[PDB]
Amino acid sequence: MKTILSNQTVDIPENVDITLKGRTVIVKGPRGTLRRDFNHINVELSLLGKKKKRLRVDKWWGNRKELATVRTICSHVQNMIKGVTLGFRYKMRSVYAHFPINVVIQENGSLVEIRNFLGEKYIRRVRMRPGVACSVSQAQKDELILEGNDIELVSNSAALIQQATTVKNKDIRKFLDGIYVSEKGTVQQAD
Amino acid sequence: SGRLWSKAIFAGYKRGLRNQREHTALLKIEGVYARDETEFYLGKRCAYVYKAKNNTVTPGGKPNKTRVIWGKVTRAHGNSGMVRAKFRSNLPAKAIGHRIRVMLYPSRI
Amino acid sequence: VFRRFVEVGRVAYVSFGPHAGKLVAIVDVIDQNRALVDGPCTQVRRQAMPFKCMQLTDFILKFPHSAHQKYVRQAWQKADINTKWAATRWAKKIEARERKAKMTDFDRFKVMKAKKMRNRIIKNEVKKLQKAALLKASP
Amino acid sequence: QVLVLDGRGHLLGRLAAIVAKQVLLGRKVVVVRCEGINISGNFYRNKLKYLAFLRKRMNTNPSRGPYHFRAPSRIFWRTVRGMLPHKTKRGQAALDRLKVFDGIPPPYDKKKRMVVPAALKVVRLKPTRKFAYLGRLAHEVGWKYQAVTATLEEKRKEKAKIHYRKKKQLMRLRKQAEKNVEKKIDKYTEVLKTH
RNA sequence: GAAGCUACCAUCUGUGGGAUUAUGACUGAACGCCUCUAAGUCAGAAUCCCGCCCAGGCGGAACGAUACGGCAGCGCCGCGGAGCCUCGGUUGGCCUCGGAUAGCCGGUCCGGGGUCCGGUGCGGAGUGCCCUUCGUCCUGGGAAACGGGGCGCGGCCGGAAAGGCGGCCGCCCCCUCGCCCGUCACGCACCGCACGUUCGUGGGGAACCUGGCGCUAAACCAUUCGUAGACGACCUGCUUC
RNA sequence: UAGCGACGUCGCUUUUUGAUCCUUCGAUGUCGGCUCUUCCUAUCAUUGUGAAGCAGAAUUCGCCAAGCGUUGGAUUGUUC
RNA sequence: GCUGCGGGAUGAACCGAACGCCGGGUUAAGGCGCCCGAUGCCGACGCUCAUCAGACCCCAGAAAAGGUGUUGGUUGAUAUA
RNA sequence: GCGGGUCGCGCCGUCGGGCCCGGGGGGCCACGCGCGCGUCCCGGGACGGCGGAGCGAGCGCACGGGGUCGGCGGCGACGU
Ligand SMILES: [Mg+2]
Ligand SMILES: [Mg+2]
Ligand SMILES: [Mg+2]
Ligand SMILES: [Mg+2]
Ligand SMILES: [Mg+2]
Ligand SMILES: [Mg+2]
Ligand SMILES: [Mg+2]
Ligand SMILES: [Mg+2]
Ligand SMILES: [Mg+2]
Ligand SMILES: [Mg+2]
Ligand SMILES: [Mg+2]
Ligand SMILES: [Mg+2]
Ligand SMILES: [Mg+2]
Ligand SMILES: [Mg+2]
Ligand SMILES: [Mg+2]
Ligand SMILES: [Mg+2]
Ligand SMILES: [Mg+2]
Ligand SMILES: [Mg+2]
Ligand SMILES: [Mg+2]
């Protein structure tokens, strides 16, 4: 109905320091820096507060779809602030039947190489994203932990793993085999 | 020295979709882009200037290749400043897109 | 961003329509697309005009919401909008455009002689200064 | 005489209309940077329309019939063919007056380039609508020359950046000169009669 | 049974990149939860397009040779003298990229930040510039140190995309009016009248006298071949060793 | 409601047959087969998928999809 | 039929309007991005995105049914306890 | 107690009847004084026939007047 100035309130904590040059948002923190490009969205961005770092995201007029849009900027800035403080950690227990699944990290944490996968001979070489590391975790049977900063890149990597492990031409209510995302969380605990 | 005539481009004939009316012409005339603007140019004269390989003139000095068809502005035409015109002999229709001089003849200030 | 948004009591310029060149003050917004404007001293009577008609500028006033012509005139005279309006570069631009439209031939003759004299002085002193810049960067 | 038009951020049909009307009157118009023309609509539908247009062909001899040009300059040229009366011996002279160039030629590196305001994306498209790139469309459909044109465009933008600093240097020098004195005999008359 | 023509009746070879559909997802609102969608992203194919492979347009390149003999003949350069045709314009532009819920200009700091402006654009293509200049003589005021034209000469190279224009320097014969304000008097004043001023020492062709610099060919046929041929077309040979 | 689905109900198709006589009666050579080219998709198989009363196999039903295949014979002139 | 003309692209029958030959002006039915004459109005108000959009009597292809796609509207039920 | 017609009361109104009548600036296509033609009005006004009475004539004009004329002006030969 052509509303007016919907506004979302994004708190910023004390450790991170934000800086924007337009609709391009650049965030710095302890665990690296980060940036995104919100160019195609056409929403007023502004920050207020001497060292309190309140951010307001403001869209005027619009439609109902664009009032739906104005919250998505708030949620992505929230996820970037969670990432640049803590970083995201995905814990994946590999669920295997009578056949084991061997998982190695081939080069420098980037490449993941999956083997033996229901007795298939085909070695499955999967290339992860830039800016994310992967490690076989300790003290747990075949748990695989992906750690990174940008949650889109990390979860795209997890989706690439779980769609690399996909059973063809069978029942998928039986043959429940694959590498699935079991837990989403932070790098540094208790935060 | 210097140009005294204003520049105008012959755009076509007064016409319907199917049939034409060849006893009248239209002129898109540069610098004019409004019905209110094409009021100064009423009553002015227009001249078409061309070449021919025979050698015939008027008191402009000596025989030339140059021939000229005269005429004058009747009325405005549409909103876009285009101007109807009537000449003494009708156009050759070779001149669609060739410049017709609009002279500062009958000035009425 | 968006330094100048409309308000109850923000002055406005009227670009295209029956009131070209005349300031108005915005009384109140009717619905999104037109608004009631009013001019006490700039000779324009209280009426509703669209937003794409009007051109916004930066002076504000202090009105009650939907006041009368009287209180609009009081705040107008107490804020001195007209003299402060003529003393900005915007109105200088409008004044120059009107003078250029209202030139004559003798005025254009004087403009071209002064234009030639200025551009010759510019050309000489620019050529001398860039030659001096070359002579400065030469050691 | 020559209307040298830019192509970044223009629209296909609008720019075709304005060029097609101006070319019948005689002003020789040249459309430069054809790869940067934006087409309104979603570009999946745009490639769908142009792909069905590729499907349209004569089944008896494909040499005689619908020539499907793939270069974007030729795309815009075919669009202007569809709007000029080319079968008449008026529009054929009109198309011979019209020139078009993908990329930028060496005369038009330095000749000044106009921008039609009635055909801009910024003016026409409500900002939440989706658009296209004719360069993207042509690279998807058979025009194999994006990687050359991108390199040449980077090169010429690098040369234009080295020209603009020189021009801004000259303007700094002339405003230093106008900050110096003795032009003010004329400037009173000039401000009275529109400096 | 030679040579040749021939057989899935002998043998040999037949190949990858891109965007994406169906679908599966991620992030995430609408709808404080959820959600593959609303903006954003990813994987994704006998389809689609291109690559690989055939034919190359009233499509364009770079290079070679560029007509003796006995006059010739023919090119580049400078011309001037005539003469036929085709027709249009009557000051020129010498350039940032990119954005629009943003951007331009000016300036200590180590291309970025901080700072100063300007802004419905005036460091403006509704604007800029030689320019509204008829010429000349007289004669004074301001501006004026580069001249400014070039048969110039000589050097440098800037430009790849479809480049020949642009600029610098040193020399050369002249201008110290190469522009404004002012004094002074003539120039065809052709006696009311259009096709005037132009980029033009335009574009093309036929020849005529002129000085200077150079050049002394190649196709096609006749013939011969047969890797090629219905005929053409095509592949080739033809040094007096 | 995996797969079907009566009682009803709304359509699409011109590859069946029918209705009409608009075109040709100073002539459009009439069935079927042989050969040969191209197109459609309302998909039989192959590529990629989803759902099953899908354990595997073998099937069935959908979707994108006409690129490429869809034969050898006894009978009847046959289409079938 | 016996009839042209201006629109409906294209037409026998449609919609205006009926015809000697011409110059000026005005309109009808229709239309005003460009073919192609006219909106080159600083037109007014809203609706809709389509991976098969939509675009004008006659008219040259579509229904029953469904949509938390959006936009209004009706009738109820909750919310200051 | 309500309505239909009649009668009389004051107030409306650049109202109408050129109204009227006597007194105390503007408009008009409206003109023979002497005296005697009839009426009306309080010696005068207005009309038809007469007592006055439209005196004198067309002169020179000017013309938004039975569809325009200049008592306006230019320019050009041996090849157009
Ligand atoms: Mg199975
Ligand atoms: Mg074979
Ligand atoms: Mg999807
Ligand atoms: Mg019949
Ligand atoms: Mg029949
Ligand atoms: Mg016959
Ligand atoms: Mg026959
Ligand atoms: Mg036949
Ligand atoms: Mg096929
Ligand atoms: Mg009959
Ligand atoms: Mg009849
Ligand atoms: Mg009829
Ligand atoms: Mg018709
Ligand atoms: Mg139709
Ligand atoms: Mg017809
Ligand atoms: Mg007529
Ligand atoms: Mg109408
Ligand atoms: Mg038009
Ligand atoms: Mg609905």
UniProtKB/Swiss-Prot annotation, chain A:
Gene that produces this protein: RPL9
GO biological process: cytoplasmic translation; translation
A Pfam family hit: Ribosomal_L6
This protein's name: Large ribosomal subunit protein uL6
InterPro entries (alphabetical): Ribosomal_uL6-like (IPR000702), Ribosomal_uL6-like_a/b-dom_sf (IPR036789), Ribosomal_uL6_a/b-dom (IPR020040), Ribosomal_uL6_CS2 (IPR002359)
Alphabetical keyword list: Acetylation, Cytoplasm, Ribonucleoprotein, Ribosomal protein
Cellular component per GO, a single term: cytosolic ribosome
Annotated localization: Cytoplasm
List of residues that carry N6-acetyllysine: K121
Family affiliation: Belongs to the universal ribosomal protein uL6 family.
UniProt entry tagged with the keyword tRNA processing: no
UniProt organism field: Homo sapiens (Human)
UniProtKB/Swiss-Prot annotation, chain B:
Species per Swiss-Prot/TrEMBL record: Homo sapiens (Human)
Keyword NADP: no
Name of this chain's protein: Large ribosomal subunit protein eL33
KW RNA-binding (keyword) present: yes
Source taxon at top rank: Eukaryota
GO molecular function: RNA binding; structural constituent of ribosome; tRNA binding
Role noted for this protein: Component of the large ribosomal subunit. The ribosome is a large ribonucleoprotein complex responsible for the synthesis of proteins in the cell. Required for the proliferation and viability of hematopoietic cells.
Pfam family, one: Ribosomal_L35Ae
Involvement in disease: Diamond-Blackfan anemia 5: A form of Diamond-Blackfan anemia, a congenital non-regenerative hypoplastic anemia that usually presents early in infancy. Diamond-Blackfan anemia is characterized by a moderate to severe macrocytic anemia, erythroblastopenia, and an increased risk of malignancy. 30 to 40% of Diamond-Blackfan anemia patients present with short stature and congenital anomalies, the most frequent being craniofacial (Pierre-Robin syndrome and cleft palate), thumb and urogenital anomalies.
Additional record remark: Knockdown of RPL35A in hematopoietic cell lines results in decreased cell proliferation, increased apoptosis, decreased biogenesis of mature 60S ribosomal subunit, and abnormal processing of large ribosomal subunit rRNA.
Residues found modified as N6-acetyllysine: K7, K62
Swiss-Prot record, chain C:
MF-aspect GO terms: cadherin binding; RNA binding; structural constituent of ribosome
UniProt keyword annotations, A-Z: Acetylation, Cytoplasm, Isopeptide bond, Phosphoprotein, Repeat, Ribonucleoprotein, Ribosomal protein, Ubl conjugation
Modified residues (N6-succinyllysine): K84
Domain of life: Eukaryota
GO cellular component, one term: cytosolic large ribosomal subunit
Phosphoserine, modified sites: S138
Entry's Gene Ontology BP terms: cytoplasmic translation; ribosomal large subunit biogenesis; rRNA processing; translation
Location in the cell: Cytoplasm
Modified residues (N6-acetyllysine): K78, K84
Transmembrane segments: none
Sites of the Glycyl lysine isopeptide (Lys-Gly) (interchain with G-Cter in SUMO2) crosslink: K123
Role: Component of the large ribosomal subunit. The ribosome is a large ribonucleoprotein complex responsible for the synthesis of proteins in the cell.
Family statement: Belongs to the eukaryotic ribosomal protein eL14 family.
Record's subunit section: Component of the large ribosomal subunit.
Protein name: Large ribosomal subunit protein eL14
Full-protein interval shown: 2 to 140 of 215
Curated annotation (Swiss-Prot), chain D:
Chain positions found as N6-acetyllysine: K187
Subcellular location: Cytoplasm
InterPro entries the record matches: Ribosomal_uL13, Ribosomal_uL13_CS, Ribosomal_uL13_euk/arc, Ribosomal_uL13_sf
Location of Citrulline modifications: R55, R136
Processing and modification events after translation: Phosphorylation at Ser-73 upon interferon-gamma treatment in monocytes involves a DAPK1-DAPK3 kinase cascade and is causing release from the ribosome, association with the GAIT complex and subsequent involvement in transcript-selective translation inhibition.
Keywords (A to Z) from UniProt: Acetylation, Citrullination, Cytoplasm, Phosphoprotein, Ribonucleoprotein, Ribosomal protein, Translation regulation
Gene Ontology CC: cytoplasm; cytosol; cytosolic large ribosomal subunit; cytosolic ribosome; focal adhesion; GAIT complex; large ribosomal subunit; membrane
GO molecular function terms attached to this record: mRNA binding; RNA binding; structural constituent of ribosome
Superkingdom, natural source: Eukaryota
Keyword Acetylation among UniProt keywords: yes
GO BP annotations, alphabetical order: cellular response to type II interferon; cytoplasmic translation; homeostatic process; lung morphogenesis; macrophage chemotaxis; negative regulation of formation of translation preinitiation complex; negative regulation of translation; positive regulation of natural killer cell proliferation
Subunit structure: Component of the 60S ribosome. Component of the GAIT complex. Interacts with EIF4G1.
Name this polypeptide is given: Large ribosomal subunit protein uL13
